[PDB]
C-alpha cells in the first residue's frame, strides 16, 4: 500500500531476508529470539543481558541503585 | 594578503618574535649589562638596537660578538641576507635600568657575598642616580633551611591604580 521501507520497524530483520512490520504478540516473540541469539554466539551483549546490566555505554557505578545492603 | 596572515593574526605573530628574541639575548648578554632591546623595521632593513649599559664588553674583539649574533638571527627566522642588522647603544643613567640593576645584584650574589650588604650597595646607587624611591627583596634560603625574606626600602612607592604602569619598572 506504498508506505516506504525506511518507515517500518524492521529492515532486513537479520537471517530472514526481508523488510517486515511486527505487531503485538509477534513483537515479543521476535525480541526474545534476538536475546537468545546473542547468548548463543555469546557475544558481550548476551552476557550483559544475562547478568542484568546495561547493554549500551553507560556507567553503572552511580546508576540503577535499588539497592539496600550497605556497609 | 597572500601568502601572509590576516590582520588579527598579524600582530600576534609579531609578538611571538618580539618575545623569543627578548629571552634569547638575555641568556648570553646578561653579564655585558643587557637591559632590553628595541626593534624597528624600516624600509628594507630590520634594526635591532641591543640596549646595554657598558658598550665595551658588548663589542668584544673587532666587533666579533655583534657579527656572531647577526648570523644566528639571519638563519633562525630564515630571512635572506641584508635584512637583519644589529646595532648597540649605551643607555645613560643606570639607576633607572631595573633589569640591569637586578642582573648586577645577581653577579654580586654569585660572587659570594652576604645579602644585606649586597642589597644596600645596589640601593644607594639607584637612589643616588635619581629616583623617588626603590625597594629590593630577596626571598629564599640563607642561615638555615627555612626560607625567609629581607626587605630593604627607601623613598616612595605605589602599588595601586593605573599610575603603576608609568612610574615603576620591575624585574
Amino acid at each position: 500500500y506504498k508506505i516506504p521501507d525506511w518507515f517500518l520497524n524492521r529492515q532486513k530483520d537479520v537471517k530472514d531476508g526481508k523488510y517486515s512490520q511486527v505487531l503485538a504478540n509477534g513483537l515479543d516473540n521476535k525480541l526474545r529470539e534476538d536475546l537468545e541469539r546473542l547468548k548463543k554466539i555469546r557475544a558481550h551483549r548476551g552476557l550483559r543481558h544475562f547478568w542484568g546490566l546495561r547493554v549500551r555505554g553507560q556507567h553503572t557505578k552511580t546508576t540503577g541503585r535499588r539497592g539496600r545492603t550497605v556497609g | 594578503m597572500a601568502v601572509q596572515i590576516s590582520k588579527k593574526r598579524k600582530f600576534v605573530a609579531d609578538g611571538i618574535f618580539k618575545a623569543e628574541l627578548n629571552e634569547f639575548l638575555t641568556r648570553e648578554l646578561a653579564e655585558d649589562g643587557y637591559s632590553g632591546v628595541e626593534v624597528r623595521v624600516t624600509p628594507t632593513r630590520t634594526e635591532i638596537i641591543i640596549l646595554a649599559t657598558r658598550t665595551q664588553n658588548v663589542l668584544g674583539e673587532k666587533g666579533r660578538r655583534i657579527r656572531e649574533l647577526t648570523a644566528v638571527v639571519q638563519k633562525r627566522f630564515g630571512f635572506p641576507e641584508g635584512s637583519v642588522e644589529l646595532y648597540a647603544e649605551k643607555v645613560a643613567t643606570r639607576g633607572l635600568c631595573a633589569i640591569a640593576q637586578a642582573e648586577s645584584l645577581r653577579y654580586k650574589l654569585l660572587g659570594g657575598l652576604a645579602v644585606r650588604r649586597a642589597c644596600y650597595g645596589v640601593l644607594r646607587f639607584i637612589m643616588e642616580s635619581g629616583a623617588k624611591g626603590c625597594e629590593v627583596v630577596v626571598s629564599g634560603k640563607l642561615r638555615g633551611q627555612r626560607a625567609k625574606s629581607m626587605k630593604f626600602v627607601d623613598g616612595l612607592m605605589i602599588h595601586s591604580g593605573d599610575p603603576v604602569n608609568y612610574y615603576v619598572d620591575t624585574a
Binding site: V14, R42, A43, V70, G71 | -
Partner: protein, 135 residues
C-alpha cells in the same frame, strides 16, 4: 562447528542466502547485506596488513587433519569482521595478558573478534571499608 539450523536448512538462512553462496560471493555483494558498520570497514579499509591473519587461517585449516580443528593463530588484533571463510578456525585473542581461545561459528559472522573475549573479571563484592560513610 557442530550446530544445525543456524545458516542453512529449515530455520535460518543468513539474510535469505546460505553460507554456500557467501563463500562464492565477493565482498561487494556480501557487504550490501544489511549491517551498516561493516560497510565502512570494507569500502574504506581494503586490507591494512590483515594479510598476516587471513593467510594463516586458510593455511592451518588446510594442513590440519580431517574431522579435527587446527591449533591456533594468535592475534593482538581484536578488530576484524568475522566472515564465512574464517569459520572452522580457532583463534586466540590477546586481552591484556591472556590469549582466550575461541572457535569460530557461522553464527558469529558480522561481529568482531573482541566481543568473544573479555578483558576484566565480571566483579564480585564486597564489604564496606573503614572510610565509606560520613561516620
Amino acid at each position: 562447528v557442530e550446530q544445525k539450523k543456524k545458516r542453512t536448512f529449515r530455520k535460518f538462512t543468513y539474510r535469505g542466502v546460505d553460507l554456500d553462496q557467501l563463500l562464492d560471493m565477493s565482498y561487494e555483494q556480501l557487504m550490501q547485506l544489511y549491517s551498516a558498520r561493516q560497510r565502512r570497514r570494507l569500502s574504506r579499509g581494503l586490507r591494512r596488513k590483515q594479510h598476516s591473519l587471513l593467510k594463516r587461517l586458510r593455511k592451518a585449516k588446510k594442513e590440519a587433519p580431517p574431522m579435527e580443528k587446527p591449533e591456533v593463530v594468535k592475534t593482538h588484533l581484536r578488530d576484524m569482521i568475522i566472515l564465512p571463510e574464517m569459520v572452522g578456525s580457532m583463534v586466540g585473542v590477546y586481552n591484556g595478558k591472556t590469549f582466550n581461545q575461541v572457535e569460530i561459528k557461522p553464527e558469529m559472522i558480522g561481529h568482531y573478534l573482541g566481543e568473544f573475549s573479555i578483558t576484566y573479571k565480571p566483579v564480585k563484592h564486597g564489604r564496606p571499608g573503614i572510610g565509606a560513610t560520613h561516620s
